[PDB]
Scaffold this active site. Structure first.
Site, PDB file in Angstrom:
ATOM      1  N   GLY A 123       0.809  -1.371   0.046  1.00 31.00           N
ATOM      2  CA  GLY A 123       0.329   0.164   0.019  1.00 31.00           C
ATOM      3  C   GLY A 123       0.428   1.567  -0.247  1.00 31.00           C
TER       4      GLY A 123
ATOM      5  N   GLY B 277       3.675   2.202  -1.970  1.00 36.23           N
ATOM      6  CA  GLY B 277       4.447   2.358  -3.057  1.00 36.23           C
ATOM      7  C   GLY B 277       6.121   2.422  -2.950  1.00 36.23           C
TER       8      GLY B 277
ATOM      9  CB  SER C  78       7.405  -2.121  -6.029  1.00 37.81           C
ATOM     10  OG  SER C  78       6.298  -2.333  -6.276  1.00 37.81           O
ATOM     11  CB  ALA C  79       6.801   2.877  -7.011  1.00 37.77           C
TER      12      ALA C  79
ATOM     13  CG  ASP D 138       1.743   2.678  -6.563  1.00 37.70           C
ATOM     14  OD1 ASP D 138       0.460   3.666  -6.118  1.00 37.70           O
ATOM     15  OD2 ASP D 138       1.847   1.946  -6.206  1.00 37.70           O
TER      16      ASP D 138
END
Length: 326
Positions: free
Chosen positions: A108, A110, A112-113, A155
């Site tokens: 939730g 973000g 990974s971004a 993201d």
């Protein structure tokens, strides 16, 4: 192919975390959304690894238990996507990658971004690519393709630019613009420990719309009024009203059936301890909630109250949004 110009990065290559303040789910249907790129960040440091091929990852982010292990395969694909996009070839001399920064990877937020953003920036440094923000954002977007589908763009855009961001599907793609704001946002973000499938929940919402076109349209328009007013509140710097609107937004999210017992418990305790507003953030049915505090001191009361009174608040973080201007 890009050849490495530097032997080690010396800059501060970061990607910001992300929370959705307004308009998760409704944005899919054309509503405006407000996304917040938070101060808290993931940092990537790179250096050459002569004679040793490929990318060696030393992932030291303060991720929740099991998160890094469970995302590693996706990360592998994500990083390779970015390398390929940037025309970086690690078949001879490779790279050692150190991943850090105070952001806590969890569903939730973000993360990974933030990962692919920080990486793109560090590569730009090491290969002296002089990527623009647009270029970094695209690189992140490509890399986000390596994590479980699918990237809308919000993201990576929050991670690249930070601050408050207006997010809408216009005219037929994701469109982003910055939101000017002159006040700090003191946030408490709470993790439920429950993983939700964006694609699955979003499709449940599509189905409800197909089953109840008139009811859904009612909730959707109800949403558009709240976001309109939220934009107002921000331009005014009216945080109490902003909070009330967040509550109203959560209420609408409950009505499209994207909340859950754990989320409800969290938001109730946040309000009890004086949150200006509190709501689920993002996919719902798990994931994170976000509360707005009036100050740093009142945040201390909310964190204390969650810990004493809300077992469903598995992970509690103090995050902030920085003002765009003086």
């Amino acid at each position: 192919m890009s050849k490495p110009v530097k032997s080690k990065t010396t800059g501060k290559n970061i990607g910001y975390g992300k929370v959705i303040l307004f308009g998760e789910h409704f944005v899919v249907h054309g509503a405006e959304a407000i996304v917040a790129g938070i101060s808290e960040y993931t940092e990537c440091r790179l250096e050459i690894n002569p004679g040793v091929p490929g990318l060696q990852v030393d992932d030291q982010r303060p991720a929740i238990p099991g998160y890094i292990a469970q995302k590693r395969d996706e990360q592998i694909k994500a990083h390779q996507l970015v390398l390929d996009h940037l025309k970086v070839d690690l078949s001879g001399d490779g790279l050692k990658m150190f991943i850090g920064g105070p952001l806590v990877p969890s569903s939730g937020i973000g993360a990974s971004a933030s990962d692919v953003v920080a990486f793109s920036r560090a590569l730009s440094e090491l290969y002296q690519l002089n990527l623009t923000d647009e270029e970094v954002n695209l690189s992140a977007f490509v890399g986000e393709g390596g994590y479980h589908g699918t990237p809308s763009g919000a993201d990576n855009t929050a991670a690249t630019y930070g601050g408050l961001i207006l997010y809408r599907r216009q005219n037929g793609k994701s469109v982003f613009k910055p939101i000017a704001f002159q006040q700090r946002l003191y946030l408490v973000v709470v993790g439920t420990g429950i993983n939700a499938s964006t694609a699955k929940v979003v499709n449940d919402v599509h189905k409800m719309k197909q089953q109840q076109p008139v009811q859904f349209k009612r909730l959707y328009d109800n949403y558009t009024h709240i976001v309109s007013q939220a934009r107002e509140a921000l331009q005014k710097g009216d945080l109490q009203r902003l909070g009330q609107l967040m509550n109203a937004n959560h209420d609408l999210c409950r009505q499209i059936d994207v909340s859950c017992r754990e989320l409800e418990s969290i938001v109730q305790t946040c309000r009890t301890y004086g949150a200006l507003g509190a709501k689920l953030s993002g996919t719902g049915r798990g994931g994170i909630a976000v509360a707005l505090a009036a100050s740093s001191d009142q945040r201390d009361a909310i964190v204390k109250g969650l810990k004493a009174k809300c077992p469903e608040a598995k992970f509690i973080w103090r995050y902030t949004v920085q003002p765009s201007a003086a």
